[PDB]
Amino acid sequence: LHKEPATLIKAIDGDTKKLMYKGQPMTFRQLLVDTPEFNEKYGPEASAFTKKMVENAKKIEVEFDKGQRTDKYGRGLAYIYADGKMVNEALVRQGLAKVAYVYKGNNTHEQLLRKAEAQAKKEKLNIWS
Numbered sequence: 001l002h003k004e005p006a007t008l009i010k011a012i013d014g015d016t017k018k019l020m021y022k023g024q025p026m027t028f029r030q031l032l033v034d035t036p037e038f039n040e041k042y043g044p045e046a047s048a049f050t051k052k053m054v055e056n057a058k059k060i061e062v063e064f065d066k067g068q069r070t071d072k073y074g075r076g077l078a079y080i081y082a083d084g085k086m087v088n089e090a091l092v093r094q095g096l097a098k099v100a101y102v103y104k105g106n107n108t109h110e111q112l113l114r115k116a117e118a119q120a121k122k123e124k125l126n127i128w129s
């Protein structure tokens with residue numbers, strides 16, 4: 001897998017955002033995670049977390065996996081990096097997302113994220129509190 005450039009257009013919520021990629025606006029959905037919706041518990045904290053991470057970043061990058069690059073809603077499916085730090089992993093490490101939606105053929109970073117989840121749980125953080 002390799003990282004590609006993008007720029008932030010707008011934060012949306014814990015696990016989706018609007019990026020410019022290859023010069024075109026797209027909504028991206030983060031691979032392998034599920035944040036609560038804004039109306040759900042820890043939804044607002046997830047949205048805030050993602051928003052800060054991507055708005056403060058000097059450099060946003062997207063990394064597609066080996067499989068499907070867009071979902072059925074037209075959303076890009078990627079791992080998202082903010083100055084080299086994976087947003088998807090950072091959410092899971094903070095107990096603000098669950099590892100989820102692990103489809104075969106698009107799960108290169110599964111074990112990395114599962115390790116983060118285990119530490120969040122040990123710490124009883126947020127969703128695991």
Ligand SMILES: Cc1cn([C@H]2C[C@H](OP(=O)(O)O)[C@@H](COP(=O)(O)O)O2)c(=O)[nH]c1=O
Nearest residue numbers: 015029030031032033034071072077101103
């Ligand atoms: C994360 C991800 C979600 N999806 C689809 C599955 C879910 O379909 P349904 O909408 O039919 O439930 C939906 C979950 O995204 P959200 O958590 O953003 O709602 O997006 C994929 O198809 N591939 C993926 O990698």
Ligand SMILES: [Ca+2]
Nearest residue numbers: 034035036037
């Ligand atoms: Ca969600």
